[PDB]
């Protein structure tokens, strides 16, 4: 496959941001629930 | 059980159904219901491919019972050849409508 160069290039820094934010969106809510599992069981 | 009162397709068919019906009795096929028969496919006697525009996709079944169909855009102009078997196809634009 051939393609044009990027219309809105995403730099290494921008990729780090995207990756970080993606990873956190999955990890933080589940993390919060799992960390607090003990609290929930007492209720 | 005999008597009348039911309309016929001649009387009541409309829109595209009617256009198909009328074209059919004149032996024409503007809505691509039938398979076209191939010519010999030479440069002198190319397959004539109607289009309402300046290009049309051709599928070439190079030999009878081939499972692989060869697909390519046929452009208006000089005859073009199937990239597999070399048979000639020529676009005949207008031929279909406006």
């Amino acid at each position: 496959i051939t393609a044009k160069p990027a219309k809105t290039p995403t730099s290494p820094k921008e990729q780090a941001i995207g990756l970080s934010v993606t990873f956190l969106s999955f990890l933080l809510p589940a993390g919060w629930v799992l960390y607090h599992l003990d609290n929930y069981k007492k209720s | 059980a005999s008597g009348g009162g039911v309309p016929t397709d001649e009387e009541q068919a409309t829109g595209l159904e009617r256009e198909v019906m009328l074209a059919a009795r004149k032996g024409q096929d503007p809505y691509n219901i039938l398979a076209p028969k191939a010519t010999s496919g030479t440069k002198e006697d190319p397959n004539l491919v109607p289009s309402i525009t300046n290009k049309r996709i051709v599928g070439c079944i190079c030999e009878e019972d081939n499972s692989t169909v060869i697909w390519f855009w046929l452009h208006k102009g000089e005859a073009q050849r199937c990239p597999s078997c070399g048979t000639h196809y020529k676009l005949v634009p207008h031929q279909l409508a406006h």
């Binding site: - | 059980a1 039911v6 009541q12 809505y31 691509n32």
Partner: protein, 259 residues
Amino acid sequence: HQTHAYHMVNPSPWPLTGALSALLMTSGLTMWFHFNSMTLLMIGLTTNMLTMYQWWRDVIRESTFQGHHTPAVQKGLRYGMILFIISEVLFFTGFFWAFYHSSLAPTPELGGCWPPTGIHPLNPLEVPLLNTSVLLASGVSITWAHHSLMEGDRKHMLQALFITITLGVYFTLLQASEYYEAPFTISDGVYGSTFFVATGFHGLHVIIGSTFLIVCFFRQLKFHFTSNHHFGFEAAAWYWHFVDVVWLFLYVSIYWWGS
């Protein structure tokens, strides 16, 4: 402008309203069964009827009034209807399977016999035989209606179709009366279960098929059908024959062999 014969349909809200009506009917059944309220269910049933009405109205508009049903489109609908009937045959086969599983190996709780101890089956030679004659007769009359339509005979089509519908209604009232008169119930173990769920789903299909025929009656009154183009009628006739054949299997299996 297209140069194929197929029908590109206008964007439509009915798929979405139909899907949501499915949610309301199912969640409604749940609310009825568990939180004794009928409210969601009635909303669901209302929206389902509205959806069906408007959807099939639009199909009539597309075909009869707009001319989109070319032979190619019609051929597609023929496949569609056959495939739908096949899926319905398989639904019923599940119930037949259940009936034969239960009746061929009656368990100790039934007394080890079929019919179970305490069950007094209906006489297959009384109303069940009448029901059989009624649906068979309705197969003859619908075939008359079909042949009259194809021969261009408006009046006899209407007469034959009316007779067909009347027989359908008669079957339905006969079965409702039989239900009321039956000394066993749906709660009478596996005999009652298999009997009422199988014949009840059949009964639903009879009502559905009768409704379909009634639609065709009113479309014929309004001159929608031509002598060559009347798929709505053919579909309804295929469906009606399906209903009849299912009856015959029920009659032989449940009423006759299972008594």
